[PDB]
Design an enzyme around this catalytic site. Structure first.
Site: not given
Length: 122
Positions: A47, A89
């Site tokens: 991420h 996300d």
């Protein structure tokens, strides 16, 4: 932005995101050095890579829309940047959820000086 990511985490994992994912292992939240501790920590590491690629998009503050289509997250923005940060996300939240089976409470608020090694390349 961090507001949407935050929602997403809670929806996908049922965990309080601050306590459960913002201090976990070596790469969740602010952490950025060391070999990741487990799968969950690795979701954090990819991420971050995902956000690095989108530096000109202001990933932390840039607001975006998302909704579901039969339970699945669908990023719903036109702005290329908003679509992309949302994709980051989304992939992370799903990653957290797909790895709840190995979530380790011992890493929740991990003492970062213990973080050794070099992480992979993004």
């Amino acid at each position: 932005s961090v507001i949407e990511f935050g929602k997403m985490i809670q929806e996908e994992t049922d965990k309080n995101p601050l306590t459960s994912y913002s201090f976990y292992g070596c790469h969740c939240g602010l952490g950025n050095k060391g070999k990741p501790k487990d799968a969950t920590d690795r979701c954090c590491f990819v991420h971050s890579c995902c956000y690095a690629k989108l530096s000109d998009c202001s990933p932390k503050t840039n607001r975006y829309e998302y909704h579901r289509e039969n339970g699945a997250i669908v990023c719903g923005s036109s702005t290329p940047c908003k679509k992309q940060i949302c994709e980051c996300d989304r992939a992370a939240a799903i990653c957290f959820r797909e790895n709840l089976k190995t979530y380790n409470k011992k890493y929740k608020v991990y003492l970062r000086f213990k973080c050794k090694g070099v992480s992979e390349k993004c």
